[model samples]
Target chain A: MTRIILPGKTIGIIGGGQLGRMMALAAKEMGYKIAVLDPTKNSPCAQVADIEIVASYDDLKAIQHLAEISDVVTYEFENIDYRCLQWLEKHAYLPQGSQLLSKTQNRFTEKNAIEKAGLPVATYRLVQNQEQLTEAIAELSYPSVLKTTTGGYDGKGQVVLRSEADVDEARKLANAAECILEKWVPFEKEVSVIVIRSVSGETKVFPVAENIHVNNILHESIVPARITEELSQKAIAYAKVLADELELVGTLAVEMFATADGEIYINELAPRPHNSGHYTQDACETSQFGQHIRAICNLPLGETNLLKPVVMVNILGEHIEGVLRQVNRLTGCYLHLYGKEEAKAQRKMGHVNILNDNIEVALEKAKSLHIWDHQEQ
Target chain B: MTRIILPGKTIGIIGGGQLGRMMALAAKEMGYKIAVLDPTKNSPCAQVADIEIVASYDDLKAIQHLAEISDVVTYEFENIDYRCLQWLEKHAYLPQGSQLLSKTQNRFTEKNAIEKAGLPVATYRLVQNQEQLTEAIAELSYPSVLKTTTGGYDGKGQVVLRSEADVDEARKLANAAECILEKWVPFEKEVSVIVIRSVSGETKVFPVAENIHVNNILHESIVPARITEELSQKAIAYAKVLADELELVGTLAVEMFATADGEIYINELAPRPHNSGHYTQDACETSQFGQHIRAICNLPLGETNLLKPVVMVNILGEHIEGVLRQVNRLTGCYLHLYGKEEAKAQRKMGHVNILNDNIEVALEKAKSLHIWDHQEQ
Candidate 1:
């Protein structure tokens, strides 16, 4: 173990989203330099970062340069290439451990890890061919979902088998791709738990955030989730157990499906700060960005107290460009726009968190923005 | 009026204090560019701003360049040269108008404006010469204060007359420059009212902040002042009346004196975002900086609601250099350190707002920082 402190140190960040943008901001405040690697020129994070390596994540030459320059390496997203991770691990200190990424990259491996950690998961079956699909369908029923085992996110690389006619299309999409067939659980709400853990195994969870999805894309996350104390405690325990087993060092987000019976089923996991934790930027005592830096730098975990009940609204594309003028007029709404030059339809431009003591007031105010609607549990 | 929306326009800030630093951060989120003007090589605002102008305020060439490149010109502190305001007025928009500087620069003009607005003011007499000083002493008594007519801030350019023996020393100090003598008001608590008025005449006031001072330096400001509703309303009304009278188009801070009998008296007026308003950065719906931008840019002002009960503590230079380790750890406390590079005693390096729903919790947490103590109201 080494004592990591600030000043005269550089932090290396993978990916260039708004999270990276904020991390660079925090690092700059503490008199530390930040280096970011992303393919896009002037990516959101690069807009504020001290140094930016504008190259793809799979570019070993660029990764090597970053590793040679940085004292610690952390990624903003989990879609990083495995070889690049191995290369960085070999050359530099990669906090959160690269081994955890391997276990979460594939669908079967993630579910197996979750079950092994004594967590409940939806009944799932691995499928390789048409015969296996048929058997999975016989066992999992027609309303099941067929998903690729790797590189699937935000409802992509997955299909629903609603009828026998759809089975062929599903198989065609799954051709030459490793897939998983799982029975779709009819859940009352989709909730997410954001947990931060140190390499020393200390973990803390922010208040659970109940999520709402639009077109299979995350629309909004309401914090201080309207759940029972028992459920919140259970979610925190499950997140900590999973992080300890993975030896996670930074922030991790565990997506869950909460049934009407209050049973929490692990749906998926991300190795970095997820969209569900965005509310913590303004609502929590220690923002997810600040906590991520602390964990990577080996500082004691801070109090994860929610400052206010909040609702986070994701800002989507050009159709809502005029929304910013109205945004500044909203009371208690913290707007965060990623420094993206252009906005295309369905692209995540930025987000805003409306914090209030009354959740209903926050919801009503967000309704006027007309970006997305909240799903009542 | 043209629609000056975000993402393209540039804001010219004239001072490089913590207020300007936070303003740069807030405006950057809305996709606005910030240009700062300050003589310091590495001022706090410059570290985060898009461009830094290093020149004296009276440099017309620098002022011309700033006007040519900026969409609007605004400043954080008062005492800006009247010539600079006139030059900015001729070339670019100077919000709140140049007359505000004229009225606020002199103690005589400030007291007259408050009284003209029907606000009660402390007993005072202008001292232009030895004869007037004798008259003021005969009427206002021996224990009086002498303040310079201009360029005074943070206990500078002021002297106290305690007795007959001190009158000669006070007069000698006051005689070096144009000064005013006033009967000292022994107040129970000092409170300040911050109000924002847009170009459209829309004005809003935050709750009065009860401030505590140690050795003539600001110690802390507790939001939602523990005062009668009548006094709070009176303070808000007085601030709005003053803004309307001045035709102000930015944030104005009215420092008021609350006596032992619960009567409020006007002490001074600052036509820019005062240090007393720093708590709004984290506690209020629309921060003073945000409102200042909105008003100066002629946008409709945002809502001014308190998000949480908060107490703001100013970290003097002693805190930055003496306890460097503790000062460094203040990073996660929503701290704003002005990058002044030099640490001089009594110089304001930064400030932090301890925000919590519970006033007691907020106060206790701020005290734990060990920089200052809260005086009994």
Candidate 2:
């Protein structure tokens, strides 16, 4: 039986990053106490949460402490160790259970689950050894992508194969973990939808977000996605189908590819708030972070209607100085910066949500902002 | 020259009530670190701020510690000791200076300032002893309101003299401090405007809000103020003039009374976020709390345009259980609880902003919510 957790209850979050920080903010607004378990002191979430268990994610003692005080536990990322989660499952109420993690943590298993749900995904094959690697290369064909099955994010553990000559270098990178080769489909556009589900089987879907990626990291997300209404509905439908299949009790972000033929294919799944959904913070009735908290706490999901057209632009570390210089000049832009001290190249320091009545104008305003320009060295 | 405090700088707040909590949330979203000073541990603002100095607002050491780390200091309330503010002014960058407090904290001084600004106020007289009280009654006439000069809020420290027979009891109630007697105006409506001014002299005004009070406590605020557009504009104009005359560098909320003859009179001034402006959080481009942070930080003030008509309702202690019972049932209502543990009678536990295209519909929806019903014996 599912029990509804009311406000003033303690919520425990794993992985204290920007997502955790945002989730903590929403939970705090709803009168909930928050505790974060992360290795870093004063991490983004720790700065906002009521208590911080300053220890590594894999530390059982730290996890135990978090579970002891928390009425319910949820995670901001999926990179947690399976064993630690298993221990947490026995001790605490994790509404989005560890089973979902086992299925979605690896590239092969994640794709398999999506396909099993009768959703279309890219053709792929697992490569365990050099022999299997060569077989996957021939089967999936050239100009494909090779990615590690686990422990990869933000384009860090993947490589592209333009031709047969790139296989040896890919093999060297694949030696660290099990690898998968996916047939590269030339996509016309990238889009995503954030779907939320409650333990009682209630579901809600946010509007589709048209995404633009630079170097495999999300650069911008334009809401009311510049797509046909039919395609947008289809994207939302696919996300809903996936969430129901997973029995998701929290936010599930589904990233997809729109082919030239106007069909969408699943690319990835994030079982927490995604960067593309950040626009909802300013443009929607309820943000993905707020929805996630409601779903986990058994509260009714909030309305997900788009209140304004928005263009969300990520602020990479290279643009921080430029953003600071022009921060006072930007109007109609909601700036959100994670309290990260150091600004490394390509690091997602924060984002800006430009709200306008017209989506095209919002996008144009987002692009025209001088803050997006890199500072001269 | 005014220096713009960029994101990543620290903002120190003096009080840790709901107003401070809301301000901290806005500052956190803008990437500013927040430090709060209040006597209570885990006060509403402390739950969200980056740091909390658990000391009284008058503690010099606590004030010094806050100033040591903060880039600029602004307060959530004006009830701090005058000497403590003097100490802070000598040590910290307190942008919204204590001079505003001196003029607004006392009823007599506040009224005098308003009249000096060429604004009309209620007929009034100073009352010190029995002789002055008798004279005030003879001058101001019967059915007058007698109030303390300082340290009064939410209808406390005041009494109504219906006739000559009620003078003794009124005098006993006004014995705590110096008093002022004003002729009571039977106004048709009560209204308020939140005016924000930046360090650069840029100013913006929110739409006037029609307020309803029960037992001298604010019960509701309806936006677009069921008043004539001319009256709303006049209210805004009066607020702007007062803000300019005061040379204010932050948010100043001006409460006013509208007579049956359609004239408006300045009633009071709050040099911080006011309860009546809480609807702006959901229905306006920039919330009063957000504008206050921007003004104090020397950032460009946000546009103060109403996005939707809203009705804001306050939740006292009697409403919490009902709210929890129907928390999932209130659609389109933005609930904001202050994270307070005890919901004492008449305490401002939280509020809800109900948004709709029509003000009447919003008010109807707000009225329909079962949480608004008083608890049964």
Candidate 3:
């Protein structure tokens, strides 16, 4: 049923990280109250949330209570147990159902679904044991990548097989659990498109975002990516194809690889707001978080048009003090700091959105700040 | 001493209304915790505030507690007791301080301050009794305005003396309390400028805004007001004058009357975020609420450059449902609804910021909504 949840309704969000914190802020501006479920006391989202039910992600009692008190349920991260979401689907109004997460949570299932939907995906082989790992390594070549099928992020749970010695060590991961051996593809740019499908079956895509990764974690994102129009259009088309194929009812951020030859390969899927989409908060007509609320509530999607050229630079734990030193002197800068008590290395403390007259101006402004470089943690 | 209140510190707001709610939301995005003191439980500000101390404006104990836990103190409205704020000045960090409030809370003091600052203000005479009111009425003539020196807003505690009978009736206000009789100026438009002064003594002024009143309440505000460049500059200059005179360390909204013959007179002043500055949230580089936090915390003032042409239309209690019905259909519309339970007539429930490529386009789009036009009671 296509039900329209009006404002003043509570939005129960799973995972009270920076993403959920931003989503709650956007939802609150539109008159929605927020209730977040997280084990951490006074999480980033909980700091601004109306009510935060402190509980574990697998705690079914807490999940049920969050749903019982909310008009709709949504999430900021996708690594949670799908069975809990499946139960939430049956008992509550999660516009983006659990089936999509089931497909996206695993590398094998994700690639197969992308290829099955007639989309472009790189060559890969699923290996469950040492024997299959050796066999798949030969099939995909020596420089192939080995990744855990179920859990991998920020380049974690991954091993790049460069030679026989590397493959011998990768056998450890292969012996422990199922893994996907991917045919390494040299890409010119790592791009992403945030495609949002409303409960009414309408889809909207934001401008292309080009990402820069440091130590396998996102460091910066430039909107209206410096790419050819044809390649940009292709990425937009691919996102729509996957959204329709998955029956997506909320925000779906499709990460992709743009090669030198102009071919694009679908790489990953996040059934929530991605880090690249953070640039939309200050540079777009409607932010990704704003669209998330509208899409899940069965409301019409807002304009995703870019309002200005912007570059969003993440503030890792190590960069927080450095940023705070210059925050008072920065201009045309929008600083958003998640209320995290501790600033450990590699942690996503917050981000800064710098807008300017052009992409180069914005990019240079970010570079001149002398922070957010690729620092190996 | 100038002090910079960093993120994660507490911002204690004295009045828990829509202005404070919006200020809290903006502060939260920057990682600040919010504490509000208001009598109404779950008031617009309290719903999103970290802590709500339920108390009256005159409650000294609650006021002190709100100050104790807060790193910086500010207020959303100026009608609160000056004595309570005076106490806060001694025991806490109230950047704007109580001196400005003592001037603004009284009509005679506000006009005298404006004139002393070398700005324009309409001819006015203070009357403490009915006998003085009759003398002032004779001096200012019919068609003048009589208003109580305190606790007047949205045309409340105000009377227009158009004839002898009206003057006689206005004596009731004069008998009850002190009043100001002002010689009415023939103005073609009402303009305003939001000037923010940082605790470091730097000030930034927003573009001029022209206002529309319905039932003596703000109905719509058009940015880059339909006035001459010189007139706009004059208004901006006047705002700076008053900001310096009052030593305003936070937001100061100076309202003025623009006469058809090119003269401009200061009309009113709000020491916090005003409804007219709501357009900045979407159309300017930095919102009034964002600037308010920066100003109070000794941070540098942000850019006040307008990013797009926008028209801010107030959604009174009567317009809430009408706007909600068409919210899903509106394009480039930024709707902000205060989380208020009751939508009584004449209440400020929310506002909508309509942005476009040009002023006329945004103005037309706001008018086409067909919900914000002047509707008399």
Candidate 4:
């Protein structure tokens, strides 16, 4: 197959946070240079990358310069401005395509894509006004989620419509006319499956990760999700179908909700490395970061076998004081701290993955680690 | 214990070849910065390091500047000018100390240290004159090796004295004033034991590697030497004693000759990472390069358990053609190529370590790889 990107070439990355940091690291190890575009100085990815172009993502001249130098252009986070991506496509290749971005940028489009893929999804409808929100609640029950189609991440741009009285406040909060009302799934657990596709048509899926959410923020991700073969296969099929449908050229993470009725519903999909896949860095044979680089650079996929079952706990701001010290004391816990400044409550500073042959043992280790740091009962 | 060189500190390396390159890669992974001091415009280590200080080692002013910016100083290879080491010590801390360099600078001092450490070494004496050479050979034995003490590496700077007729001719080629005559041991195989000693008085040794050499150059290193437990223990004991005696703070690789009678004798010891330990990069739980950084930085010594049996094959200039293509075809084969501009015959450009649980299977794979590349039968 003809190659669009090869090893030893440069990848232009937007956002120099931990995701970009690891992507740069993975690219460098595979003999690729990284030119990162981020406003911040000494960003984590910038520390290890070949060059750091200190400019905002919307800087057109800087985007052109990066596109001229890089073989392929990609981003770390999904909140990047659509104009910047369009500008990059004009000068260089943007893998996973701009359409994938457009489709995933809005809640309405993403939900439509999920339904078209023959996958189960929570019932939802677009809510342009308070009247629409009231009608959606009337149709799908009172307890539902009001989420902005664009500019939403990490619980931002989202509100819970607890009852008929809360609909007006939630509608006012989601000011965007493009917002959607998602019928809440009474899930027993949340999980995410990461899928990678090469331009050559080959695809691979990582084991499903059981996740926990605290205050709507990701709290933890456990690998080799305690599920039956049917659930695992369903997750993989959904992820692969989405990748194939979008014609994605890099990693795609599909977040899902497992209902008590043994049904799986697609939550959302990130077109790059997601926070839920960070545990693969220490617990899998080939890390998700490495696989993303491989997919973007057009290298053959590596073995994605889990080295050992693992439980990854996020290091929130509350545990920032003695997080590392307490983590160091935990046997079999692999700590990864992103070089970020300041720790606010619910802020993800880093994560720890505990590996063990026994899933119960791994969970116990993670629980004790949390208790030791947060004094949790 | 107080840490002299802690994590997040930059280590300035004197050379930027493969050994320094590997050290830089390993150190970076351990959250330490690396700066290489080399005359080469683009050294291998420079490609991945935080900074590359380009200058000759003799420029004392530049060396001092490097030391000023560095937390600790280390090196890639031997054969460095003693004056530079002496100058650096006066300015900053050099791990393994100046005494080690002073002792290992010449063949005479190296033999003396081995003998002084109560280790079994070949009978040896200085050959400063023709008369001394004649007298030393008579006592040490006729079929002995005459070698220059300084500036010799990879079997260079040495000659084998066969009979009385070749003594004078061998003396002329040898740096007589700085040479030594030693009785050669008729050994069954060449082996190496790699050990790491931390500044905290902690020590660890990897499994001994049995090696094969052709015309004095190492060809391959086969792990899990077929030697008995008694031999392994003796090898580890020898390394530990030497480390203590020299106060070595990093990796110390002791090359040994196992005589036909199954006796292990000290050949030489390198204060830095050894070529024979490259297999550890892929086969062991913790690589020699990683261990060296851990030891110097005062981190806990990681477990050196062998994860898989591996056979490492060095790639010379003759095998440069189609090397990468051939390497990509072999499963479980990790190819590491040093970023050298040109490939010279017999130069240590790169190597590949083929790992597998079965030693015989790994060896067969290595042999098959060589054959597929149309290398020597």
Candidate 5:
């Protein structure tokens, strides 16, 4: 029989970022105690959680201590060391187990899993050495992206090659690490869906969000993505299929590329709440963070109905002052700041979800705001 | 110029109950550090607050410490010792100020203030001695309620006199405290509105809520109160009138009675987030707690638009087990628990906000829940 961890039980989170901070807020409201483990002192999650262990993610002793005190352990991000996760799994009940993490942690493995689940993905070939990279380039031709199989996020640790002239630079950037070279799909839009699965096998998918990226970092996410109804349903169906294949017991974010031809291809998998789903906090019946908590605790899944059309804009470091100056002027805007001390360039300081009955009006209002003009320094 | 305490500043709250807990959650989301002062150790607010000052409401030293550390100080309840509030005002910036508390702390003064502000209220008279009680009874006639001027909540410190036979027992119950004898107005329904005002003189009012009481305690509150549009507007207009008259710098919950003839009469005043407004947490653009935080911080008030029709039901001690068993069965229900350890009879354990597109459907779902069937024992 599946065990349900009630509200009084303590929940432990591995990383202490905005996702964990939000999860803690939801859990705290539901009468649960929260503990967070992260190396950074006073990380965003620490400010809200009951207890925070300031230690490296791979620290075995710290992990053990967190497990001993927590009824169930989960994480906010997927970059945790696999060995540490293995230790936690052996010692504590992590409902969203290590199997999903192992499959999703690496780009190649994630794509492999998606392919095995019969989902469409961009054509790709794994390259372990420079020789294999040359062979992949020969087969895939120009206009390819070379990415390390592991340890990359937010457009980092990857290089785009447009022609043969860029191969030498791409090899030098790869630095002999295991990598994957893929043909670049001409996607008209990038979108994502957050799927939640409970321990009892119940599943729910939030509305698809159309994401816009600037310099490889997410800039804004518009919900109820301006797509045909059939395509939107197809995207949700694909996300549900992926969640079922992984036997997911918590929230999983699936990013995909939509071509001009109206085809959707899998791009990446996030085994926790995704940045693109932040709009759900204000525009949906159940927020992604709330859904994640409910799923991990073996509670019934909540309805994912959209309450309003919304546009979510990321507030990077450079936009903090600009946003603070005019934030009071933006009607129907919900500002959420991640309590980080220093606002470095390109750092995700917070986000704002602008809600309106009309999506175009919300998008127009969001665009008129000065925060979007902030460029990375 | 009014000083606006931005999100990074610290806020001090005087109580550690569920209201403080919720206010702290909203403040934390906006990047504000929270410090709560209360007598109980490990109170609900303490669980989420950055610091907890374990001291009585009258502890001068603790109050000084809190004033020294906090950029601004606000409170959850209005029944604080006046001397401590005076001390806080002298040493720190208590944005809501002490004047409101002085008037609202005593029932007679609160009613007087309401009447002075050109608002309608129940017929009442102050009784400081036995002779005054006799005189008031003679003028107001039979079937009146005798209540202590101060130190009462949740139906405590009051007695109902149906006729001359009950006056002796009522006086004995009063026990020499200054009292008010109010003629019980035959009200058709009880309702409330949450009004917020900023130091900058901005004001906003939430939609009126229809309240159902069991044993003089609030059992349920339905938003958009089953009232005509004209009456709802009248109720909101009256709340704004009272808020402006008091020059309130924070949230004030105005409880009123709507007679069958559509006349609204003021009943009481609470100068903080009220239980009747908890539905705003899930169904409104900004929650009452969020509005309170913004008001005290001198920030612009958020929009008070209703996102969905909602019915809020309180969870008393006896209903916890039943709620725990079937909480998963309710769709579109948002549960909020106070994290109290001992569930004593008549204690407010938490509440659930049921929301739907149709008000009747939400009300029906809220009523059909088994938790409502658990009677007080």
Candidate 6:
């Protein structure tokens, strides 16, 4: 993990989304070249990247070319095919490596790793079919979640079990894949911690971010999470513990659910830069994107201190025009657009980070902008 | 002036140097595509630019290609040929038009414009030949400076007249161009103000910068310049005055000499982003690059408050390795390296911005690093 890939070398990124674009921007600042692989032409990342290998994540020919030209390899998301990651493991300098992806790419393996780290997660059971899912639900509570173990994001590939009423209806559905039956965590407040372990075995965590979800998507993240300081420290401690348990390198976002009693449960893990840490790009000494580059390159990790109170609100595609209309009057807010072309509804178009002396004031300003308000169907 | 070229449009920039690269990065953050024109194939700016038109500054065919493909046109520096700028103005929306370039490209015209703006400049006389230079020097005092009016940078095309011994020596040289014979300014310190006016007629000024020169090249710039508040206010006022006089719609840097007495004199002007304002990238609410984009795009000007006391030290090509060696231990120092491959002597490789609570502490840390120390020939 301590191996150093110096600057003046190329970094190959697997997915060319906004995260990869921000990472490329950070690496470019330090004189590093970027080669991103995404199937789409002129992707948000490819718009600024030096080289764009337009190919799918599983394309062996593209992966080999990326490996040969790049000094180090990293990924922005978990949608990459396992074979490509395995091939890079043998042929490229992937400091984060393929081991964690095997765990992070599936919910069951992710929860198992979290449990191995001596942290408590929501009680869950594995199931392969509807019959097994039914059996598992009987063992759990009424309001539980039936989630596919793989390839699920946002609200996709998920179903909730409220009572016997929906069970038969769910039974009529296809249950062709392995799944997890997780007991509903009655969380009062949800928070996430961004943990980074460098290639040199140095680890640090960013300030905790309290998430506010609207209609199943993350709408905003607040720092100094409205929770007690004790719970916040516990949240960070759990993330740190998981960092070593998973032998992680580069950036990780470990999200947890805080109960009404202040007890926290590790909800899930993301091995790449998470949406919650977007505010760090504008409000911290080193953004998570910059930290990810330094962590994978074996450079010294930078400061993660918060420079100002921030409330980062996501600008869904539907809200871009609303935000643009207020552009003339917006103040103290840093707006970041991802160079994405279309304004498709609910798509992650960009984010606006409100920075102010008072977090409450920042939150109020974010509300007054009204761009993030829920829209009528 | 308030005509808006929205963020989704392409920005064509002339002279793809470090300034263009940085402006590209800032514009990219705001979802703007960049097209940089430079002769070099992989120039620092071209490495990240969306469209790189490989051509010399004056190449008419290349400039037309850039203007047609771009939504708005801007230049990184003043080295552009007049014909290229004129073509851009007629065919493209150039907010910071070619009018100001005529003044800044020549020192004689620049000084006259400054004086017309109700600002005082060093006493000077224009001369096209050696005899006129001698006459002008006699009219002034001994120890004056003789500078070419055009195409001079970094101590090039300049000669000093300290006494009769040097004048007789200088007369043997060719003075085949227009020149400015000015009395040397025996001032205390040099400072600069970064003034920006938006396309909407709103203007703002950044914190003043105190410059330290070594061997005629800018070595360091300290924010909250070591000057009295009255003098700092005057420096900013002069830059604001010049901004209006120039009818500026983008970022401009006004360099001034602050005397030991309460007075100050306007020294020089750069119509684009200036080196002295580099500290804004890491130590201010809005970087000059970002502000430049907002200004030209008809967006609101951002806040110009200084986030921290900072000392910015330039990393010449020779000092890059020294800084790299100390990269592991460096803290509170943000390093930016323009992706230039060769380590040519005295060439600008990058800069390090040291942000601290105490300006004096930052200066001490910069000195203690010892990377900026001059080397033996």
Residues A34-70, model 2: lDDT tens digits: 9999999999999899999999888888899999999
lDDT tens digits, residue span A1-377, model 1: 44564433789999888878887766655445678999998888776666889998888889889888898889986778777788787778887667788888899999999998889998999999888888899998868889899986544688887778788788886675889998888888889998898655567888999998876778889987788888888888888888877778888899998888889999999888888998987777667887888778766556687767899988878435656657446556767777777888777888888877799899888887654533222
TM-score of chain A of 2: 0.96
CA shift of A167, model 4, Å: 4.9
Judged by TM-score, which candidate is best? 5
Which structure is stronger by TM-score: 3 or 5?
Answer: 5
Candidate 3 wrongly placed segments (more than 4 Å): A373-377, B373-377
TM-score of 2: 0.94
Q: Model 3 fnat?
A: 0.62
TM-score of 6: 0.95
For model 2, the superposed segments whose C-alpha errors exceed 4 Å read A164-169, A374-377, B129-143, B171-176, B375-377
What's the distance in Å from true for residue B298, model 4? 2.0
* Clash pairs (backbone) in predicted model 4: B107-B149
What is the per-residue lDDT of model 6 for residues B323-366, given as tens digits with 9 covering 90 to 100? 88888766778889999878997899999888888999998888
Looking at chain B only, the TM-scores across the models are: 0.92, 0.97, 0.96, 0.94, 0.96, 0.97
Kindly report the docking quality category of candidate 5: medium
What is the per-residue lDDT of model 5 for residues B32-141, given as tens digits with 9 covering 90 to 100? 89999999999999999998899878788998898889999998856678788888888799988899989998999999999999999989999988888889999999
From the highest lDDT down, the ranking of the candidates is 5, 3, 2, 6, 1, 4
Ranking of predictions according to TM-score? 5, 3, 6, 2, 1, 4
TM-scores for every predicted model: 0.90, 0.94, 0.96, 0.86, 0.97, 0.95
Query: Candidate 2, residue A68: CA error in Å?
Result: 0.7
Residue-wise C-alpha lDDT for candidate 1, range B314-347, written one tens digit per residue: 7787776433455434433555555566778778
Model 6 chain A worst lDDT run, 10 consecutive residues? A168-177
Which residue pairs overlap in candidate 6's backbone? Answer: A1-A199
